[PDB]
Write a protein that binds this ligand. Structure first.
Ligand code: ADP
Ligand code: ADP
Ligand code: ADP
Ligand code: MG
Ligand code: MG
Ligand code: MG
Lengths: 578, 315, 51, 470, 193, 158, 193
């Protein structure tokens, strides 16, 4: 490998001479302490290396060693139930050998090199292997981890190890060429993993949250952005998606958050339970954790590591959900890195290539046919935090241009303690037109038209606000008081959900369809009674209001009996009325 | 023909690299860059001098080193091989097929930058196009040879309007008594910085209409190299000019979301440390945009025509 | 009448003026950055006149 | 020992010395001239041919013939000991109180290692600051970073001195009574003038608060590199005490705007291209390395709490120093100029102020069980009264209903009694008593945010306890 | 060169009511017509070319569209000169440098046009000069100065822009020629902010 | 502005009767400095001075709009040198009119940008205050001498 | 050097109602009076020089008009010292460096004025120091920094400007002199944005 010596030290910038043959953007180890850095410029015999960590104490003449590879992650068994930083350093193993502080120059491995795994071969000698096929399986918690050949490797199998206990470092398959395949391989974080073909979105990503995946659904493999201010629910919704979605593996990325907020996430997450099996939620999630005082390079590269791990788990045939918390803090690190490189700014101080990076990050999602012949998907949900609620900042326009859904939060509904606090007037979704051939085959034939009727009822209430803000609410006509009351019923009994309840935390499509049918059955009969001619106050007092309200807290397996009872009850009550 | 290689690389930084002894590289030439691993990159000469020649790389410079990199000359001017068989095909903006079919056999090789049309050789556009929209056909009518862009917002359906105009376009020869025949119609569709969800809509609309048999598509995706976005409209306009002025076609060119083109141009300009303009954009955008829009029109003594409908989203 | 007049006239003009002033200040800052880059380049070029 | 005499260039704050490749980057050096005077300096760039040194103080007497440079230490270090309680330092570790220098138990680098995120634990205990508008509505939790936003003429220094004088912990309210815990205050003053220096010196010594405090004081005419180094030394002492002797420490940083400007001229003197509005591009990371040194650690009984103080330049909350501080800190306390001009002290305005970790430090098992609902009710009632007060000026008092007049009187009495405490040292129980006395002026049943259980227990007391002596 | 410059005292009749009544321009004066896009600068300058009472009209299309030159080349041979009954194109000189033509030639076209207008002034004729856009000339100066690595003054323009603009507009006026005749040149320049 | 300046130069007089001196004064001598002036304004000024008969008492320094730009650096200095010489050596009362200081500032900015000086606001050189001060402060009165210098500069606000 | 600094407890009477009542300044305090041209900075400072109760007044005309210094030279010998009854000029020292004087002497005038003001402090007097414009000092520093080819600050000023400004203002205060007597220096400085 290429080895040189330091020639000039000035802040984080180091000039090393004797480095002829080193390649651009390689990872180098600087000094006797082993500080890591990247080569950013080549000039003759010298190379410019930008050191990640603190450089105080370095001297001229200390060795510089090039690893010869760009920034990459180790992909293999042992990533689940793990906590990593932005450059895939296991924090738990760092804590054991160092204490409460992170000393500079510590060396650890992403995958444990001494843990034994249960090997089970699938290929036999004489077989031809191409990139993406399965060599064998290894059990890991509730899953079976498939051992994949790297995508750039092809050849014929020479020898296969028998079944037994092995570590990740021992070769299991060796080809006729002489290349030895281990249980793990490395891949650059900035290069997308190849696939065969990208399929269309035609299956919904069930979030379990009534408003989110009834009014503004997101398809499997889609993208969504959820901006909002403090106390608006951003975090509970995310962790609720982690708890209740139909994704097999969850990847959580935190880019440069506050320390006391990463503390909450790191402490609370091991205490949650997986609703599928009752085991810990940690057994199917990977967290990337970065605070504000970590090096800016790790904060900038945090999301690429997460999306690469999500792509690796997608390549095994799973369905992966990726949650990127506060991409604005990633854009801040990008701005800082661009400022240190002396590049020209654009708009609000951001580098001109911000939109290109955001487009390159969001484009990795989608449902694909993997190289192994199996389907997989990655779904990305990215949180945004505007500086003052103005969606005119550059990051929000750059996000709005590419995302397929937009869940706008509002603190005004949080002030009224109405959760989820989602502004249904400013939100939108572009996956509704391609999802209803799934809805009217697996939910109910009348589901789409019922959804549009409910949306129309919600819209008609909003068009009467300039009446109520001038004239008192009680003075209105019967035909308008009726729609105001049905709007209140929708806002309080359908668009409201409790995540801490035993049964209300998760809602299925049949239950939501039943509730919507129940509400429309109430509304049509109240309207017909209005032309029949009755006191409006008597309608607002009828006992079927309790049947409307108490439909939320009924259990999933006992809902249909309640639905049929309420269906007969509303008719019986409105026939009893004069 | 022989090939010549240069190995005197002396400086690599960002998108630029310097070659020492390359005194016989023409200005604006296309070079072919090879590294030690065998991966092949492209580039263009942006400045040539006795001491060194400056080459910018079409994509990222990861993996290059001063010991093993070599630069090879391809051609003195960027050219595209055009043919009458390009109809019904799809290309990735740089000119390679992405439909899985074998590549074409070029009848001619034309420079992609084009040449200005002589104002004496032009003639007045006078043929009215009926589009089927009252707000257009009556108050903003479109003429063969006109360049009429659509100013759109973020969530507004500009693409549906463009597709509807492409479907319903007709010339109405009966109002002037100009016979019954149709001089053949063609559509050239160029997409810069488009997403898969949107591109699928255009693909399905063209398949449903059946207009794919007389259309050429140049597709540049959001994860493609940023330079390939710059070259995308020029090759589409080269193909349209070739068809219209050598085979008497009436072509219709649709350029989608030129805001992506302008941001790509801003990236490329700011990568070379130049004096910026009104909002960080380069100060020479007017000439660069004029070299794209001005290629449409009608020519005296010829039957073909080029009509442009660019689409851009107002920030 | 006063409520409608204020809401539909007075606020958007003030917002447009703010948006114009912000762009002017940002442009001046960008020009200053370019000038600082040029003077730094001249400073670094000065030291190599006679090594 | 060894001296370098190859000086080749002097201009302003920088000098070049040849053949000095043995000097490590960031080292501290001593500059000696022909008159025998010794100045300090820091190495900012090392190369094969020469090294660049930034000089403290001024360079009036220097010349290229007789100047020499000698090494002091490769890494800036500070000697720490428990003798430091009751001492004053000039910002680089030199005592200025006249007492002999301390004997160090250890010498630690002033730049600190980051805390491992898996080693922290959630803050769960509060600090009694003695101010009702902070204790009741914006409670400060052990391990929180709660800055104070002030203007130009507002009395931030007096509030800082009062908080440092009155701060204490309450172990009797926690659990069964627990046990006595040590407490200490670390004060860092950066860019202060002579008047504020004399004020702080008199204030800390006139009441006996010096025996539990460490003072780092940096004048406005001192070198700017000392102003850079001061908060790191303060945090080093605080971390040493808290995580090696289980102290509960409180760090007060007097003015971070001075720190940000000093960082600006230091970056400008090192030929660095600035970022937004002339400020350095790495200001966010540099400020994060200071704020994120506070917190509480699993397995440790000590803690560090920070109260940064800064002055908004033109009252612009979008300015970079207030903007980036809100991205790292956990709320803010905003002083109001109108309350100051009305004669109310301290001028803490409860409407834009916020504490984000408040809910973790309140509730049964600590303080009192009715804290959160009382705070919410006070906030809502004050918000109503404020706009009723503006409506009165147009429509007249007689056009209001009875409830609007009661809200107006509640707002007046609130500003008169709750906020305007003067120099009183109020416990949490007294503040809650006054809060319930103010809520008694509102009729029962309009207190929507409070449950009937607490209303039936605390509602009804008259204001005479503080009304008889405001 | 000329012998003397005289004070203008006769109107330049443009054929438009608002310009000829409210804001008149003299037979040796200068005028500027700024405006946003799609406002009427070109239609106003072609109407002046069609209907004014000048003897010779010189049209300088510095950096504009190529279809307008085709319109001028086609329509004008069929129209009638207002004051001599001949074709309108017989009194017109066109200098065309479109937007996709080379950038550095924008500067030369303005000087060529004003020099031809000065030449026809020396024969005793009354000449009207129209410049389609001077902002394109300013952009050409900016591009050349950027290639020269000069320091920009404001908005990226070179600091000597005002001197060039003043030198261009000063060539107008009513003069007594070296041959003893009387002639005048009017300059109407459009600006595109 | 030019009409106002011409009217002031035409109508200006002192009132010794109000001050009680009883003297009859003599008219002001005029020094006229034109920088980048156009023919339209220069002809107006010439005709006004011809009609008022003030050309026999006037010294004119003319730098037209088609003249070279860098000559504008010198003109105010020579005009003020002549004015100071007349006023403080021959006891004249001198009135000085400078047509456009904006053109002088552009001429100074050209040289400042050619020399890579550190600019102030809007690109003007940092020493423009001192350079403008070396022109303006040459007026006033001197103890023990009868003469005086009065300045009426004219400038256009962009 | 001095023996010990003291707290401020005695007001500096200026003779203006708004400054004496609403915004007081103590005997050893500092103050700043910024404003645009034509707002009243010079008239206020000269009124302070006339009517204040300081024993000795030192006036620094850093880079301003010469007529302002002429007014002080002419009118002060005719006025009356408020607390002694003699001529007012007998207690005043003037340092004059007008606008058309050489640029580099502006900093020297400020330092000379503050040194003289400290010298009169050591004799037991209370001295008031007026700086007519501290912005011209910054402009002179910028002009020299241009000739030094060094890296400038936000608006072209040298980075060490704030250190100089801080070192100038912190020379004021009420002290115990080396001889055991008591003196004070108060500084009022104008800013011209
Ligand atoms: N489904 C829900 N049920 C009850 N409370 C909710 C729900 N969703 C959000 N909230 C409330 O929203 C608030 C915001 O919490 P969190 O998301 O953790 O922080 P932030 O939104 O400020 O990032 C919480 O106090 C929580 O009580
Ligand atoms: N006097 C006019 N009468 C009718 N239409 C006019 C007139 N002036 C301008 N227009 C309209 O303005 C449009 C283009 O204006 P144009 O001269 O191109 O302005 P610019 O050159 O600034 O773009 C033409 O389509 C024309 O219809
Ligand atoms: N206290 C005052 N009483 C009366 N007139 C004043 C007062 N202060 C200022 N002025 C007027 O305002 C003008 C301000 O001039 P001056 O203070 O010399 O300029 P600047 O403030 O720009 O240095 C003076 O001509 C004076 O007539
Ligand atoms: Mg959150
Ligand atoms: Mg035009
Ligand atoms: Mg003044």
């Amino acid at each position: 490998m290429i080895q040189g010596v330091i020639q000039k030290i000035a802040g984080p910038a180091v000039i090393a001479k004797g480095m002829l043959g080193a390649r651009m953007y390689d990872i180098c180890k600087v000094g006797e302490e082993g500080l890591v850095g990247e080569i950013i410029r080549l000039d003759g015999d010298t190379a410019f290396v930008q050191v990640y960590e603190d450089t105080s104490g370095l001297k001229v003449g200390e060795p510089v060693v090039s690893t010869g590879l760009p920034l990459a992650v180790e992909l293999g068994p042992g990533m689940l139930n793990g906590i990593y930083d932005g450059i895939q350093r296991p924090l738990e193993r760092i804590r054991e050998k160092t204490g409460i502080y992170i000393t500079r120059g510590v060396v650890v491995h992403a995958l444990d090199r001494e843990k034994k795994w249960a090997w089970t071969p699938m290929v036999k000698p004489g077989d031809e292997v191409r990139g993406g096929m399965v060599l064998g399986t290894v059990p890991e918690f509730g899953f079976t981890h498939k051992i994949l050949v790297p995508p750039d490797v092809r050849g014929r199998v020479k020898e296969v190890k028998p079944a037994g206990e092995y570590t990740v470092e021992e070769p299991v398959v060796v080809l006729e060429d002489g290349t030895e395949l281990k249980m793990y391989h490395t891949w650059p974080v900035r290069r997308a993993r190849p696939v065969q073909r990208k399929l269309d979105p035609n299956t919904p990503f069930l979030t379990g949250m009534r408003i989110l995946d009834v009014l503004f659904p997101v398809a499997m493999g889609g993208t969504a952005a959820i901006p909002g201010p403090f106390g608006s629910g951003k975090t509970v919704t995310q962790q609720s998606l982690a708890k209740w979605s139909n994704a097999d593996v969850v990847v959580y990325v935190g880019c440069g958050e506050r320390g006391n907020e990463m503390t909450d996430v790191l402490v609370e997450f091991p205490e949650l339970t997986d609703p599928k099996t009752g085991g810990p939620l940690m057994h199917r999630t990977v967290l990337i954790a970065n605070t504000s005082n970590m090096p800016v390079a790790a904060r900038e590269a945090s999301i690429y590591v997460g999306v690469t791990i999500a792509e690796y788990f997608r390549d095994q045939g799973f369905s992966v959900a990726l949650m990127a918390d506060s991409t604005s803090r990633w854009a801040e690190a990008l701005r800082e890195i661009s400022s240190r490189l002396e590049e020209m700014p654009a708009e609000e101080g951001y580098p001109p290539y911000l939109a290109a990076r955001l487009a390159a990050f969001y484009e990795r999602a989608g449902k694909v046919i993997t190289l192994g012949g199996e389907e997989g998907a990655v779904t990305i949900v990215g949180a945004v935090s505007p500086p003052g609620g103005d969606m005119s900042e550059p990051v929000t326009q750059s996000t709005l241009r590419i995302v397929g859904a937009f869940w706008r939060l509002d603190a005004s509904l949080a002030f009224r303690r109405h959760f989820p606090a989602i502004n249904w007037n400013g939100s939108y979704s572009l996956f509704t037109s391609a999802l209803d051939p799934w809805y009217r085959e697996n939910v109910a034939e009348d589901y789409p038209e019922l959804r549009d009727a409910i949306s129309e009822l919600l819209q008609r209430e909003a068009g009467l606000q300039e009446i109520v803000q001038l004239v008192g609410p009680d003075a209105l006509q019967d035909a308008e008081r009726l729609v105001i009351e049905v709007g209140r019923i929708i806002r309080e009994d359908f668009l409201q959900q409790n995540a801490y309840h035993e049964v209300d935390a998760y809602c299925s499509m049949k239950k939501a369809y039943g509730i919507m049918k129940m509400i429309l059955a109430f509304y049509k009969e109240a309207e017909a009674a209005i032309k029949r001619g009755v006191s409006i106050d008597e309608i607002l007092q009828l006992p079927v209001l309790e049947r409307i309200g108490r439909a939320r807290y009924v259990s999933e397996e006992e809902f249909p009996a309640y639905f049929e009872e309420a269906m007969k009850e509303i008719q019986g009550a409105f026939k009893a009325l004069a | 023909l022989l090939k010549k290689e240069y190995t005197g690389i002396t400086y690599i930084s960002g998108p630029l690299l310097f070659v020492e002894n390359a005194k016989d590289l023409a200005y604006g030439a296309i070079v072919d860059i090879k590294d030690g691993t065998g991966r092949v990159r492209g580039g263009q000469v942006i400045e040539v001098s006795e001491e060194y020649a400056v080459i910018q790389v079409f994509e990222e410079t990861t993996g290059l080193d001063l010991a093993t990199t070599s630069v090879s000359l391809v051609e003195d001017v960027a050219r595209l091989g055009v043919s009458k068989e390009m109809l019904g095909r799809r290309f990735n903006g740089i000119g390679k097929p992405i439909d899985g079919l074998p590549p074409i056999t070029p009848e001619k090789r034309l420079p992609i930058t084009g040449l200005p049309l002589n104002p004496v050789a032009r003639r007045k556009p006078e043929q009215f196009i009926q589009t089927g929209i009252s707000t257009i056909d009556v108050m903003n009518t479109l003429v063969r040879g006109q360049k009429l862009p659509i100013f759109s917002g973020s969530g507004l359906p500009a693409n549906e309007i463009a597709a509807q105009i492409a479907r319903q376009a007709t010339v109405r020869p009966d109002l002037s008594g100009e016979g019954e025949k149709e001089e053949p119609f063609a559509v050239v569709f160029a997409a810069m910085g488009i997403t898969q969800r949107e591109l699928s809509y255009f693909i399905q609309e063209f398949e449903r209409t059946g207009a794919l048999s007389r259309s050429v598509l140049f597709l540049n995706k959001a994860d493609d190299p940023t330079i390939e976005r710059i070259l995308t409209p020029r090759m589409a306009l080269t193909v349209a000019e070739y068809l219209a002025f050598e085979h008497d076609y009436h072509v219709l060119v649709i350029l989608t979301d030129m805001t992506n083109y302008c941001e790509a141009l801003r990236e490329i300009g700011a990568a070379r440390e130049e004096i910026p303009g009104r909002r960080g954009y380069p100060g020479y955008m007017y000439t660069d945009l004029a070299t794209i829009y001005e290629r449409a029109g009608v020519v005296e003594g010829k039957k073909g025509s080029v009509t442009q409908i660019p689409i851009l989203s107002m920030p | 009448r006063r409520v409608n007049a204020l809401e539909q006239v007075v606020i958007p003009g003030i917002r447009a003026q703010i948006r114009f002033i912000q762009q002017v200040l940002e442009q001046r800052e960008r020009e200053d950055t370019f000038r600082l880059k040029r003077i730094k380049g001249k400073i670094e070029a000065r030291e190599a006149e006679e090594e | 020992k060894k001296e370098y005499t190859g000086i080749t260039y002097i201009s302003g704050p920088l000098l070049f010395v040849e053949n000095a490749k043995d000097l490590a980057y960031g080292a501290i050096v001593d500059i000696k001239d022909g008159t025998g005077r010794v100045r300090g300096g820091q190495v900012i760039e090392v190369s094969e041919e020469y090294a660049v040194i930034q000089v403290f103080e001024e360079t009036t007497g220097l010349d290229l013939a007789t100047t020499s440079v000698s090494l002091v230490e490769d890494v800036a270090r500070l000697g720490v000991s428990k003798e430091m309680l009751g001492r004053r330092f000039n910002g680089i570790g030199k005592p200025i109180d006249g007492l002999p220098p301390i004997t160090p138990e250890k010498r630690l680098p002033i730049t600190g290692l980051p805390l491992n995120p898996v080693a922290r634990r959630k803050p769960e205990q509060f600090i009694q600051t003695g101010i009702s508008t902070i204790d009741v509505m914006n409670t400060l939790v052990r391990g929180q970073k709660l800055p104070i936003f002030s203007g130009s003429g507002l009395p931030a220094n007096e509030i800082a001195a009062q908080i440092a004088r009155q701060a204490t912990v309450r172990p009797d309210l926690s659990g069964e009574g627990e046990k006595e815990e040590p407490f200490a205050v670390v004060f860092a003053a950066m860019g202060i003038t002579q008047r504020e220096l004399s004020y702080f010196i008199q204030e800390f010594e006139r009441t006996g608060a010096l025996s539990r405090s460490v003072l780092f004081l940096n004048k406005a005419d001192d070198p700017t590199i000392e102003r850079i180094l001061t908060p790191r030394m303060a945090l080093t002492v605080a971390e040493y005490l808290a995580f090696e002797h289980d102290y509960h420490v409180l760090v007060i940083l007097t003015d971070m705007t001075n720190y940000c400007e000093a960082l600006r001229e230091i970056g400008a003197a090192r030929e660095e291209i600035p970022g937004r509005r002339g400020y350095p591009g790495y200001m966010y990371t540099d400020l994060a390395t200071i704020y994120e040194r506070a917190g509480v650690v699993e397995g440790k009984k000590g803690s560090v709490t920070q109260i940064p103080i800064l002055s908004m330049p033109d009252d612009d909350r979008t300015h970079p120093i207030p903007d980036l501080t809100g991205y790292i800190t956990e709320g803010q306390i905003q002083l109001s100029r109108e309350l100051h001009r009305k004669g109310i002290y301290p001028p803490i305005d409860p409407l834009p102020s916020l504490s984000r970790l408040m809910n973790n430090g309140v509730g049964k098992g600590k303080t009192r069980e009715d804290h959160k609902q009382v705070s919410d009710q006070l906030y809502s009632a004050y918000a109503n009264g404020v706009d009723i007060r503006k409506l009165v000026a147009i429509i007249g008092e007689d056009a209001l209903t009875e409830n609007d007049r009661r809200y107006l009187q509640f707002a007046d009495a609130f500003e008169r009694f709750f906020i305007n405490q003067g120099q009183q040292n109020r416990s949490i129980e007294e503040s809650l008593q006054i809060a319930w006395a103010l809520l008694s002026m509102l009729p029962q049943g309009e207190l929507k945010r409070i449950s009937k259980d607490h209303i039936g227990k605390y509602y009804g007391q008259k204001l005479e306890e503080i009304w008889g002596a405001p």
